[PDB]
Amino acid sequence: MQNVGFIGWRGMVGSVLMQRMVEERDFDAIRPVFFSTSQLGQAAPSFGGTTGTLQDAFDLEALKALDIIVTCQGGDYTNEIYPKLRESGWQGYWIDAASSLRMKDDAIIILDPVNQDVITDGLNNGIRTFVGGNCTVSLMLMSLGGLFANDLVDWVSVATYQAASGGGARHMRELLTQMGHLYGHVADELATPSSAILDIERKVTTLTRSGELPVDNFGVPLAGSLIPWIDKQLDNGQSREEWKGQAETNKILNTSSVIPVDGLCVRVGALRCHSQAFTIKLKKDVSIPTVEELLAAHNPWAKVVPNDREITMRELTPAAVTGTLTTPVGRLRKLNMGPEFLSAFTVGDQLLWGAAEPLRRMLRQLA
């Protein structure tokens, strides 16, 4: 049995990972060791039917004793610990959810249902660092994997509807709380049938701009609004979120020719699901039936939602997808621009395939 250490397993992403591992009984085949900074010496979570004690996440000697490290602790932690281990000669496997190491030449971005070939090769070539890809790119490739796998993509233009979970636990609470303020502010008139909507809307619009809304985490209001800018501004005018699309998609698929991927990343009032609108340029005129076939064939999670009104409203929404491993694709049809212009709308839970799932699957291969 491999000695696998877990860091940040009590965080939001870490908690989902634990849930998933318990659910898949991933703890049976390994010897889990839980790390922390707080309740040291105190009994481990015992998820792995283990009766051990919590280790010091910053004790290098304890980390070096591991065969595999799985962290959902974050970039600050990865940035402090990873180089110390590598430089100390540690050659165990490092599985990470943080973006820190994604673009390193000795690290592979993991999304096995999409790039197991890249993973296996790297494995056979000494790569011992596997990093999960950005939630947006990860969900996109899980849904449109069949198109890429068949080398049908010339370029991709995206428009996202990103969930608060991408920001974090505090962000999600902030979104729900604002929903509370907005409704509570007009609770009575909403209960009065004769009340005028313009009177109701007037009050909520005013409250939204008043400054009373709790916006510590997002900076500005999210409930009833949206924010067309996700994280750091770059010189080319992209936000770091938009920049990842091309960099990560191409590194994951391990392309030879760069596939242009760009668009606008928008934060919306959803909790865990990221929905994406696509304008995909195909290299050849492929029929929609053929397209639906390739897509559905790539993996079991890419559920193709027929392009019909009723079923779309039922299945292609955050409401239908939250908490599930399904990454549906719908609204597939050709755009007026031409037979080579394809439209697609995807939805996917940010914390599963967009965060914890890829990590869980990789450990399994190393177990």
Place this chain on the structure above:
Amino acid sequence: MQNVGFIGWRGMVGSVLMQRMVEERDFDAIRPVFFSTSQLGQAAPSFGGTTGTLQDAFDLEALKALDIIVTCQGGDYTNEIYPKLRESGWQGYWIDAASSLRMKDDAIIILDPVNQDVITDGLNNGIRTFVGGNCTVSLMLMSLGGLFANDLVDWVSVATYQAASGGGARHMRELLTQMGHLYGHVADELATPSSAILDIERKVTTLTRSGELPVDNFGVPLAGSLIPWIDKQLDNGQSREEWKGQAETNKILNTSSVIPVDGLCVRVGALRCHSQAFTIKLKKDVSIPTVEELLAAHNPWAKVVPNDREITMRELTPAAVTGTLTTPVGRLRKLNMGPEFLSAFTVGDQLLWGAAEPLRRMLRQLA
């Protein structure tokens, strides 16, 4: 003074119209006659100053007696009344918010800041029917008018984030009520700092699918979600909202060559503002500072928000636009696919330029 008849001036769109006409004192240069389907014969509102009474909206004689008819009543009304009045020989002016007559050869889609030239031509070529354009297209053109005016657009791919006001006053109340349900369901947990975010989320996700959420108007939940399908399903796999994109843009602009306009229309948890993400292909490599100048110079409502993080967060959002006449454009830059690819994000109030404002302005041109 022209005798102007108002139909459905008590509905939501009609109420905004009445509010705007009062703000600009548009009732002074006209003889307003207020109609109703409800109680007739009763006194008229004092917005018009008149000491008149409410007439019968279905009384063809009373309607024939007018010089101009401004109705926010709806397609059903229009489909019955309009053809009758036209058949009885009525040549007065008919200003409609409903989409019914938009594509008639004897009608012009009005958005004067964008196509005044066309409104004047038809106004000289015997056109007596002017209809407001689809909220999505009106707003797009108000923000992106500069690029179109200068004939720089090859095609346009859109991904919209549409507000509930587009659906109606019931839809807006439904959205807000849903926010109340979601929050109330986890009100206590949110108030408990120590509560687990995943428990809070699990509760909300289950409630959303419980069927306990009032969804009479949108069919499925909207709060915390989104619906990638708006209105009737067309045979080309396009929804009617998506179909209006190319149909209305070209008629409004009265193009000599069809400009392809297509994409996905999505309903989101917003009250009055429609936001839209664009991938615009330009006919020629134009610089961003230029594009910025062309857009800002087309009309005073097309505010160009610099492609910078802080201001974008504060100025290019529904929170910053609801209730104003401003139709901002931001996130302008070249996409990875090439220098002829322009990205743009716009926000606009659905009830003003998207509904009431074009009518008010047209009426003012005929007084």
